[PDB]
Structure 1
């Protein structure tokens, strides 16, 4: 009920799997088991306006494990692009993911998330993170470890979907 199809794009288990697990259990995974293809997880929030369900498709970010690849995006209702601020390469790969997503999903909200900002060694400075600007993506610095801005992307997506700009998540 009141569920949306969400597609998560980025390097496999480079934060997408960790992010999904952290929102699921609350634990912060340490191991890096690169995601295989995609895993679909229910993920429920409670807003001032009732329950909300995300059908998060944590997709694999490694080509060898891409599997169906863009086929996962079919019928997607929202998209979360990810990248690790500690590695510029995963940032330069961002435009490719955006291209593929828009190509499959022409008009969908997009959140550009910089994962694991908590790790002190930040390579992709906040100054250079600009692709969202021209593409009109909603940006967030996040970190699944310390939960910095841990909820901002999901809250923004829920607001953009339901249409309530002032909608707020609730504990229960």
Structure 2
């Protein structure tokens, strides 16, 4: 008896360093497409339909960015948030360092009791030869899975998830988990 069942409305906010792939993640989830050209700073206003554990959910997707007006509209994004996606890039150890240094303090300040899913995006670059060579000149290497999991443990995240928006792998499961968290 699913027909006519009222949908549940929930709000998701996605944050993280510039160029880690926040907007690309939202477009892959919403449209089942990895865009490569003409991608905006933030994804269009979007409410996604998702069915999880038998519940019909309408999930509002709030994208954020990091300069000028976006520095100001970002803190205004947090009211009434039900789940946070906090993103770093596996090809950027620096973006992972900003998880405890910047993003977790900001989210705890404005969204104290809201579940956080820590997302390591660009997992397709972990074993990319060119990426590994560029990071090697800085004596760095791509983030290891256990390093992402460790950071998720440290910040009390609802979960740790890895994605490639480029291949689309893992993206559905991130938003399914976020929806389960939002329903809590």
Normalised TM-score (structure 2): 0.77
Report which stretch shifted further, 66-75 or 88-97.
66-75
* Matched residue, 1:144: 165
Distance in 2 between residues matched to 1:31 and 1:99, nearest whole Å: 33
Shift, 1:39, TM fit: 4.7
Distance in 1 between residues matched to 2:160 and 2:20, nearest whole Å: 18
- Kindly indicate which of the two structures has a greater share of residues assigned to helix: 2
Provide, for residues 113-166 of structure 1, a one-character-per-residue CA deviation record: whole Å limited to 9, x for no partner: 011111224611223222211222110111111122222222222223334xxx
Contact 2:15 / 2:85 at 8 angstroms: preserved in 1?
yes
Distance in 2 between residues matched to 1:125 and 1:43, nearest whole Å: 31
CA change 1:127–1:144 in 2 (3 A) is: same
Larger radius of gyration: 2
Distance in 1 between residues matched to 2:52 and 2:97, nearest whole Å: 35
| Secondary structure class of the residue paired with 1:75 | coil
Normalised TM-score (structure 1): 0.82
Unaligned runs of 5+ in 1: 164-172
Shift, 1:90, TM fit: 1.2
Shift, 1:53, TM fit: 1.3
Report which stretch shifted further, 68-77 or 105-114.
68-77
Shift, 1:58, TM fit: 0.8
* Matched residue, 1:67: 72
Contact 1:13 / 1:33 at 8 angstroms: preserved in 2?
no
Contact 1:6 / 1:55 at 8 angstroms: preserved in 2?
yes
- In angstroms, what is the RMSD of aligned CA positions? 2.1
> Does residue 61 of structure 2 align to residue 40 of structure 1?
no
| Secondary structure class of the residue paired with 1:89 | helix
- Kindly indicate which of the two structures has a greater share of residues assigned to strand: 1
Within the candidate set 123, 147, 156, 1:128 is matched to: 147
* Matched residue, 1:155: 176
> Does residue 64 of structure 2 align to residue 55 of structure 1?
no
| Secondary structure class of the residue paired with 2:86 | strand
* Matched residue, 2:120: 114
Unaligned runs of 5+ in 2: 1-6, 132-140
